């Protein structure tokens, strides 16, 4: 079970001044939480005339949605009054709407003795909740796998090493076997002499990529996701590429989506490239 709760504030200026009769509709800007919603309101009703009808309309979506909604009017103090809510989740589909034909009387509202229209402004507040659905002991305590941790020791203490990787002047002791089973790039090298010099990755980031090769974990990834991506791509480390595509994606912001997009085009980051594009548009 997953429930995404979001809301939208709509203000109609000089309400009592709208040239809408019985049946005319005035939509609002479309709002979001990847689907597009929007409110609809008929000032004089739909048939009946002595009421205001309010609907929640799912404007755009990629082919079915369950959602609960709550409509209400906000006073001047920002508080909530005259709230009506759907007692369950209704399903929406591209173009479908659900709401209340008889939301609030044309006359209880306009009466300034209730002030629901400060400066003759109607403040409609909508709250939407999109709901979506998503194992006895053994008696014998079995230790948790230590494979990664022990292989990590080989890297950390340089034990039984058999080759040397020169990273921009600095030398690092390694193991051809592990590097070859771990990287198509390294395997292809030891295939065709115990000394390989790396000229495309900085030492700090390197130590991190070797940490991954030996353990499947990259503890400091966050501090260097962009460089470790560049490195993961050059040495065919698919999982680490995506582990970085994931880190970068979670940091997408207004003032950086341009940058991260370029990174993705250069290092063929399918997933991250999508997430970055979709983000730029969501802020067009």
């Amino acid at each position: 079970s997953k429930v995404v709760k979001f809301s939208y504030m709509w203000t109609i200026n000089n309400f009592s001044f709208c040239r809408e009769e019985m049946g005319e509709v005035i939509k609002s800007s479309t709002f979001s939480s990847k689907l597009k919603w929007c409110l609809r309101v008929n000032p004089k009703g739909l048939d009946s005339k002595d009421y205001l009808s309010l609907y929640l309309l799912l404007v755009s979506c990629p082919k079915e949605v369950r959602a609960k909604f709550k409509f209400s009017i906000l006073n001047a103090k920002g508080e909530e009054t005259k709230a009506m809510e759907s007692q369950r989740a209704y399903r929406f589909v591209q173009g479908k709407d659900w709401g209340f034909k008889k939301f609030i009387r044309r006359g209880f509202l306009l009466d300034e003795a209730n002030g629901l229209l400060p400066d003759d402004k109607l403040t409609l507040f909508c709250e939407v909740s999109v709901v979506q659905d998503s194992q006895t002991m053994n008696m014998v305590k079995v230790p948790e796998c230590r494979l990664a941790d022990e292989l990590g020791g080989l890297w950390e203490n340089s034990r039984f090493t058999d080759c040397c990787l020169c990273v921009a002047g600095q030398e690092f002791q390694a193991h051809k076997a592990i590097l070859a089973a771990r990287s198509p790039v390294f395997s292809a090298m030891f295939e065709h002499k115990n000394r390989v010099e790396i000229n495309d990755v900085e030492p700090e980031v390197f130590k991190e990529m070797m940490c991954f090769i030996y353990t499947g974990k990259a503890p400091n990834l966050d501090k260097m996701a962009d460089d470790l991506l560049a490195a993961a791509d050059k040495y065919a480390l698919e999982r680490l590429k995506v582990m970085c595509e994931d880190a970068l994606c979670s940091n997408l912001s207004v003032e950086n989506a341009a940058e991260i997009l370029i990174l993705a085009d250069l290092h063929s980051a399918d997933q991250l490239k999508t997430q970055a594009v979709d983000f730029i548009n969501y802020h067009a």
């Binding site: 609907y55 007692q87 479908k96 709407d97 659900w98 709401g99 034909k101 008889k102």
Partner: peptide, 6 residues
């Protein structure tokens, strides 16, 4: 009561 325009 909840309804749809459609």
């Amino acid at each position: 009561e909840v309804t749809s325009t459609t």
